[PDB]
Design a protein around this ligand. Sequence first.
Ligand SMILES: Cc1cc2nc3c(=O)[nH]c(=O)nc-3n(C[C@H](O)[C@H](O)[C@H](O)CO)c2cc1N(C)C
Ligand SMILES: Cc1cc2nc3c(=O)[nH]c(=O)nc-3n(C[C@H](O)[C@H](O)[C@H](O)CO)c2cc1N(C)C
Lengths: 350, 350
Amino acid sequence: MKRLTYISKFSRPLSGDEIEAIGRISSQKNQQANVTGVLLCLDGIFFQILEGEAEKIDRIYERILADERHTDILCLKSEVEVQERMFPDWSMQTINLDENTDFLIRPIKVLLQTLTESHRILEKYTQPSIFKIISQGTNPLNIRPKAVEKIVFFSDIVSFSTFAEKLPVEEVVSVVNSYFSVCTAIITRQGGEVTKFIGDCVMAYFDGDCADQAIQASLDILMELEILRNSAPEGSPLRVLYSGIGLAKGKVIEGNIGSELKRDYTILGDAVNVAARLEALTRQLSQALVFSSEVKNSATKSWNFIWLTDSELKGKSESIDIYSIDNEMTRKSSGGLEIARNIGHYLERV
Amino acid sequence: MKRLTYISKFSRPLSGDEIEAIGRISSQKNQQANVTGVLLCLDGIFFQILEGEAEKIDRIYERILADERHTDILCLKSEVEVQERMFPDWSMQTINLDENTDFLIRPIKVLLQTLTESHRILEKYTQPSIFKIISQGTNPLNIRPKAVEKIVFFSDIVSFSTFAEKLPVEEVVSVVNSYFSVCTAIITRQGGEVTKFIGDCVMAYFDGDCADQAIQASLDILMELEILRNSAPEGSPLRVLYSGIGLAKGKVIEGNIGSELKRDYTILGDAVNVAARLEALTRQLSQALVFSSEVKNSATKSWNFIWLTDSELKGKSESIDIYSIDNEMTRKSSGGLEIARNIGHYLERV
Ligand SMILES: Cc1cc2nc3c(=O)[nH]c(=O)nc-3n(C[C@H](O)[C@H](O)[C@H](O)CO)c2cc1N(C)C
Ligand SMILES: Cc1cc2nc3c(=O)[nH]c(=O)nc-3n(C[C@H](O)[C@H](O)[C@H](O)CO)c2cc1N(C)C
């Protein structure tokens, strides 16, 4: 079978009566499906273990995930090869530790709480792909390195040094984090993975056969930033936030790369270098979005490709043909590269 | 008072009798010091909460940290402003959950275990500075951004593309991770912080008044790699592993930078760019280690500085004077940059 173990946070307060009530209705709809498990709660935190049929389990959990009485739902463990059940006795036993006064459950309550808020902290510092992998039923640390084709995405803020020059530290961080949120949301919805931030640069990747998603995610980012600029308060740093984006494609190594005590599940390869180099040429080329020939040809949609240049770098000494896409949004975003050359004054007066 | 909460792993097996025995001797030496708390164990994992006087607490914990009957000791929480005690009743009560059969502690045992291995996984993906900050009694997520002077360290592998060209993926990752371990150990012991890996590049920083530690950590790395090369098996990829290092100094922003769901506690500033640019010139300059004028002058030891060049980049259009240090190790390491231009053949035959 499949055994899922998750934790979540109360969206708003709940009383034992509502908790127990969710317990009962849980047990019933569970008995119907031969699903077994436990539900605990401790100071506004839910713990649950559910076991049963794969298709059954995922369907319950899809409903648990869209239920608005809890949030920050995180799968701690997914076992997909289960043959045994740990909670044969309960369709959905519920244990409210808040009310518990028992002598040994007490020291155990404060451990749980401390373990949990700690885990919550680490979650915030943890790459998204790690929890994906965990929810797909694998331990990230056990994945062997592998060669894979990827589209690599690289982006940064135009004239970011002017920002950090002129703005108080809290505004600078605020601006960068806004940027990073915009990119991460759109890249994730489009099926990609944001893998690293460095300075004000985003690095991400999509599966090798997803050039169209890479390009679209990028056009969407340009669009989102345009909404954000024209929507921002008067004098806002935000009104002159502009990005350059660079796309490349290549075979890369995917896996656990790092020192002994600290690793990233990430990629490593020539395409990472190429995408970064491409993004850096967006100033010279006056194109907010630049990508390689291979990204272009690997694309299968009717994009309005424009040949930009024949350019050198690296490497093997061969010139690489560089492309963008011509439409209202890239034109506006490309014009924004010029604007961004001279925002020091504007920024000065925030 | 101060309340410390940590978890650790059994270095080797222990029986309840040894566990309880550590409990008793714990309770006694604790009663002596007005220290209170709890010790739990669950399948080869120790949980402990200790409360008492700051100087008392740190002294016990210094002894706990160097005790070889457990490992992977991680402080989950440090409270330094405590006025109340949660475990007034026990100098060191011990609760072995392994033996427990109680009806509700049972579902609680499997939660603890799952929460814990999960937390263990995330630890591996988590920056070192986060646990430092936690052990110093602060929640990393609550630290406001701040301007600070830093020496930024940047390093990478010479001709790394030849490696990823010629070597199987497992060897490539093995080689990079070896590199990253060597740098991280030495940078950490010398008081610095490795903050990010990107491709095969390390980025780190030291406090602004620690140029001497920055330089020494770097010389030590060159030395460590030399030991590693000349110590490696015949034909090993390792025997042609070489690094270039770049040091810069400047005022930077330190803080939580990232999207909503994923952040790094890191730095951001011109000095980060400058150090990277400096490291890239190590090929041109034929100097394994290059650093800026400011790093030099901020240094207070009798280093054997050699002026390298007057170089341009960035930025503000001003030429920056670039330095290295002249001794047997930098000379050997600088000669290694030439060697590394032509290791494709050697690597081919591994
Ligand atoms: C902690 C918690 C546990 C839940 N467990 C279950 C569950 O085990 N089975 C189930 O069908 N539905 C559940 N639910 C919610 C149910 O999916 C929905 O109430 C109904 O099944 C939708 O018809 C749970 C909800 C919870 N809330 C408080 C966040
Ligand atoms: C789980 C565990 C808890 C410990 N707790 C304590 C403790 O609470 N107080 C203390 O003085 N010493 C301890 N110790 C170890 C002691 O520091 C040393 O045995 C002596 O104090 C050194 O004289 C603990 C050791 C442990 N091992 C099994 C990893």
